[PDB]
Ligand binder design. Structure first.
Ligand SMILES: *[C@@H]1O[C@H](CO[C@@H]2O[C@@H](C)[C@@H](O)[C@@H](O)[C@@H]2O)[C@@H](O[C@@H]2O[C@H](CO)[C@@H](O[C@@H]3O[C@H](CO[C@H]4O[C@H](CO)[C@@H](O)[C@H](O)[C@@H]4O)[C@@H](O)[C@H](O[C@H]4O[C@H](CO)[C@@H](O)[C@H](O)[C@@H]4O)[C@@H]3O)[C@H](O)[C@H]2NC(C)=O)[C@H](O)[C@H]1NC(C)=O
Ligand SMILES: *[C@@H]1O[C@H](CO[C@@H]2O[C@@H](C)[C@@H](O)[C@@H](O)[C@@H]2O)[C@@H](O[C@@H]2O[C@H](CO)[C@@H](O)[C@H](O)[C@H]2NC(C)=O)[C@H](O)[C@H]1NC(C)=O
Ligand SMILES: Nc1ncnc2c1ncn2[C@@H]1O[C@H](COP(=O)(O)OP(=O)(O)OC[C@H]2O[C@H](O)[C@H](O)[C@@H]2O)[C@@H](O)[C@H]1O
Ligand SMILES: *[C@@H]1O[C@H](CO[C@@H]2O[C@@H](C)[C@@H](O)[C@@H](O)[C@@H]2O)[C@@H](O)[C@H](O)[C@H]1NC(C)=O
Ligand SMILES: *[C@@H]1O[C@H](CO[C@@H]2O[C@@H](C)[C@@H](O)[C@@H](O)[C@@H]2O)[C@@H](O)[C@H](O)[C@H]1NC(C)=O
Ligand SMILES: *[C@@H]1O[C@H](CO)[C@@H](O)[C@H](O)[C@H]1NC(C)=O
Ligand SMILES: *[C@@H]1O[C@H](CO)[C@@H](O)[C@H](O)[C@H]1NC(C)=O
Ligand SMILES: NC(=O)c1cccnc1
Lengths: 209, 209
């Protein structure tokens, strides 16, 4: 029953979408790549991902971007995408990430938003275009890091957006990822460092005793 | 087996008194030998190494009051919410909207839920929350949908039990059974959470334009 487009969108699911480049769904980079990961661990993070929810491409862009036409840009949630409390204030706190913690991210290293290693794509409230590849060394723009020196981030729940439920945890950094790497706070992990279950467990948090 | 770190052989169950062969080392605190083979539970447990890199007795020594059968798991402070730099829990009161899907490992007399599909390692649960108590709910696993909006404590999950945590937890003010009896939640059949589209979000509105 799973498919690129909801069944309602056929026979012409790309109607209203201006074709630009055939790498992307309907030719539109905002709709993300046609090709998705078929191997662990990335396929595990995408197993619950219905890219448009129950919407069709033009409906999705009409809802979440300023225009269905190519000049339209995605609109992002207020308060940095933190889930809002009953007083419409973001839920978050400053928190120290411990040495050893593993983080990952879909996007360039000029960004400031990470998630705990292995968070489902739908928990991140990201649009489909964060899966576009810009560097062949990092398919799907997917990066994994490990904390090598303690540092403080804004930490809190992710608000739903982009037709997904959110409710992962996001870490919002004060320095971009590249600067954290170059300053010795993060190191990059290669696939052999995150392709076994034990690499997802936690050896750094001490026990109560 | 692969239940155990290779370093734990021979006698990976050293120090563990055998009780019942449903469970690892015969110990219900260590969870079931047989893990789920179907979506979504297999997706939720694909990154779960139940002992981390510890051997069974080491795991219980770290996280329970006793390796002997009478030892009980020790739980994190502040109801398991991640702590900020001032050592206060990060959380807020939040309204769960009609349509949101939630899940839970545990009986309906409890009060802790997660967004549908959260990886087991994001929940900072001990292995015994996977034990089956009712044949109608293999692995203790329950799925719900909000039918009337209500307020919960909402916040990030601290690491515990050798896992990274950092999902979002919802701590309810009434137990789950009362929420069902009062019309706030309904129970979902497996048919209602075995398709990718059923994990997407149709209830959150798009930005005002
Ligand atoms: C989230 O919302 C919570 C309330 O939400 C509602 O209620 C829940 C149960 C659901 O139904 C939900 O759907 C509703 O929306 C909110 O809970 C509130 O938390 C505060 C702070 O913890 C509580 O205040 C404390 O109250 C106790 C009890 O006071 C009564 O008895 C004492 C007897 O000593 C009398 O003196 C009072 O007049 C009351 O009759 C107080 O003992 C306590 O005082 C102590 O702490 C304060 C701190 O300010 C000091 O000033 C004092 O000197 C004491 O040291 C607090 O005043 C409040 O009762 C509680 N409300 C309810 C309805 O339970 C929670 O704080 C929200 N959380 C967040 C993160 O926003
Ligand atoms: C979280 O902390 C920031 C301040 O963090 C410091 O500055 C950052 C740039 C980063 O380097 C951190 O590691 C530092 O510890 C708070 O922002 C400050 O808030 C105070 C209070 O009003 C204000 O006077 C300062 O000007 C702010 N400083 C900056 C740089 O913005 C922020 O409010 C904290 N958030 C929470 C939720 O506690
Ligand atoms: N190598 C690249 N070359 C050119 N453009 C790129 C490249 N990589 C990404 N883009 C484009 O850069 C943009 C994404 O930047 P990014 O750093 O990757 O990922 P984000 O999710 O953190 O940034 C989105 C933020 O923007 C909102 O306001 C919120 O603050 C969001 O957090 C896309 O248009 C890409 O086409
Ligand atoms: C964005 O562009 C709109 C026109 O786009 C053009 O016309 C439509 C019918 C498609 O054929 C599309 O491929 C073309 O590029 C404008 O009407 C609209 O005002 C523009 N938005 C802004 C903010 O300038
Ligand atoms: C907890 O249990 C400890 C060991 O109990 C012994 O081993 C188990 C397997 C049973 O056979 C039991 O009958 C044995 O006595 C005790 O040493 C300890 O006192 C108990 N209580 C506490 C609080 O630790
Ligand atoms: C545009 O399409 C061409 C194929 O004609 C492809 O080689 C190129 O990489 C595409 N551009 C992007 C940014 O993907
Ligand atoms: C082990 O536990 C299961 C479930 O509680 C039960 O069905 C089974 O009978 C138990 N085995 C023994 C030998 O008690
Ligand atoms: N780019 C990401 O992977 C991301 C975005 C928002 C929150 N957490 C992680």
């Amino acid at each position: 029953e799973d498919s690129l487009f909801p069944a309602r969108c056929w026979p012409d699911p790309c109607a209203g979408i201006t074709f630009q480049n055939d790498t992307y769904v309907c030719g539109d980079p905002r709709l993300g790549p046609v090709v998705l990961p078929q191997k662990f661990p990335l396929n595990n993070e995408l197993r619950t991902y219905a890219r448009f929810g129950a919407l069709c491409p033009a409906e999705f862009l009409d809802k979440w971007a300023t225009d269905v036409a190519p000049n339209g840009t995605y609109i992002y949630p207020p308060a940095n995408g933190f889930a809002l409390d009953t007083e419409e204030q973001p839920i978050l706190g400053n928190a120290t990430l411990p040495v050893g913690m593993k983080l990952d991210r879909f996007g360039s290293e000029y960004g400031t938003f990470l998630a705990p290693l292995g968070a489902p794509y739908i928990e991140r409230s990201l649009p489909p275009s964060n899966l576009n590849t810009f560097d062949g060394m990092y398919p799907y723009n997917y990066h994994v890091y490990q904390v090598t020196k303690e540092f403080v981030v804004g930490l809190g729940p992710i608000a739903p957006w982009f037709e997904q439920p959110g409710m992962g945890t996001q870490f919002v950094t004060y320095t971009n990822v590249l600067g954290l790497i170059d300053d010795g706070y993060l190191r990059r992990l290669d696939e052999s460092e995150y392709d076994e279950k034990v690499e997802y467990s936690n050896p750094y948090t001490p026990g109560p005793n």
